């Protein structure tokens, strides 16, 4: 690595690996929760 090098320039990398296990969830997107409703038909999203 020298700044004059493009395929020979330094690149920083971050790889995000996501676990979609059957377990309780742990890291969420910013989507805001709302109150539960029962016996009425609903569109739903639990943990994604």
């Amino acid at each position: 690595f020298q700044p004059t090098n493009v395929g020979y320039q330094p690149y920083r990398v971050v790889v995000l690996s996501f676990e979609l296990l059957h377990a309780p969830a742990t890291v969420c997107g910013p989507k805001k929760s709302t109150n539960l409703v029962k016996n009425k038909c609903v569109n739903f999203n639990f943990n994604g």
Binding site: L21, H22, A23, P24
Partner: peptide
């Protein structure tokens, strides 16, 4: 020394509820 395990030492393979079923 040794002993027969019989049919002990089964465990839940994943955190999913399943009931009244023969699941592979």
């Amino acid at each position: 020394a040794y002993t027969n395990s019989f049919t002990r030492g089964v465990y839940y393979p994943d955190k999913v509820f399943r009931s009244s079923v023969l699941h592979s």
